Subunit: 234 residues, 2 copies
């Protein structure tokens, strides 16, 4: 109802946890961190969260109709160029900033205070954007389309940019249809107005990765490290 | 040695402005008003301030006894590896943090709010460190040795690491004796509070590399090639 939308909705919901399988076994409502620094366990968790998020986004992308038939170089470049944005967007959409809870794609819940040592300030900024995003009340099928459009977009280096644009057209039409059926323009213009906040969060993430890499407590995962190096204009 | 102390003192003094040579013609404590974030003119000033200290610190280093006798590859690595830290320590000591005043090696005086957009938060950390250094009341001969010790120090990739080590021990001996020959015989809490400034300085250097990373990302104005080189040479990945 109709078919593309059902498949985007199903790809989205399968790429994250239900309330049922939310994982509280590391959660603590209060920890007392030494702010402004970090040990190897904090940095390794930060990295494992990034990697595990990319594994899950890759499986989600694989379920967007048309995506797995793009060239493998093209699927790679789309995912790599969109990963930080999608990580931040999906994280903000699923978290609970009214309770200081970051809820990650595996179901793991961690308090803001438990993220502070690995993520630095970035996690605080991500919760602010959670509130910012939640204030728009973006429904699931809308979010399912929008996140996919974050991924399926022009990027410098695509082998088949027109195939990618064609798929962007199909997803945009699918979204317009849904916003019509539901309305029965403005949320989206409202939404587009938060894109500068999102772009700042992406930069804040690259900055956090630079700092950790400088620090070098543990080495970064290969693919995260490629993504970071590839995003650098120099 | 002795004569080391005098040489070190003369190299330091000769590498900065006379009080009578201070330039206040650009100083404004009131800017009109801050937001939004850095534009191109702020960034270009940040790089101009950095670059301005390049030749000065290289000429100062040449006057340290023994520095010109390290290998040329070793002099270049020491200089590049110590550049941000020397810049920061010498700024900190020269400025007047009680008043928000930054005094650069050209003699140029700028208020911290004139600097803030270019430097980011870094300017505030540098200002905290400068308050902290100023409290320790470091005399000029002690400072003359400390700055030299920032420069002449073990670095990855030295060809003659034991020779860097000899010249550094020479300088640390000079310092230690001077701090004993002023502040009580025959012993050195003063001394390890002084030397305690070296790790905090490293930590601030890292904050500089962060700002530069961020500006290169933004890319409104590119670093000049020498700063860029120091940034890329000093990123250990």
């Amino acid at each position: 109802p109709a078919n593309l939308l059902t498949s985007l909705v199903r790809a989205h919901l399968d790429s994250g946890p239900s309330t049922a399988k939310l994982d509280y076994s590391k959660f603590q409502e209060l920890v007392l961190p030494h702010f402004g620094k970090e040990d190897a366990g904090d940095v390794q968790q930060f990295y494992d969260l990034l990697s595990g998020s990319l594994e899950v986004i890759r499986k989600w992308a694989e379920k967007i109709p048309g995506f797995a038939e793009l060239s493998p170089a093209d699927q790679d470049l789309l995912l790599e160029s969109a990963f930080l944005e999608l990580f931040i967007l999906r994280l903000a959409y699923r978290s609970k900033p009214g309770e200081g809870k970051l809820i990650f794609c595996s179901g793991l819940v961690l308090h803001r205070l438990q993220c502070a040592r690995g993520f630095g300030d970035w996690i605080d900024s991500i919760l602010a954007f959670s509130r910012s995003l939640h204030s728009l009340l973006v429904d699931v099928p809308a979010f399912a389309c929008l996140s996919a459009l974050v991924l399926i977009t022009d990027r410098h280096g695509l082998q088949e940019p027109r195939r990618v644009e064609e798929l962007q057209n199909r997803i945009a039409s699918c979204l317009k249809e849904h916003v019509a059926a539901v309305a029965g323009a403005s949320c989206l213009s409202r939404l587009l107005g938060k894109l500068p906040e999102l772009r700042t969060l992406c930069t804040q993430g690259l900055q956090r990765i630079f700092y950790l890499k400088l620090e070098d407590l543990v080495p970064p995962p290969p693919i995260i490290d490629k993504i970071f190096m590839d995003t650098l204009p120099f």
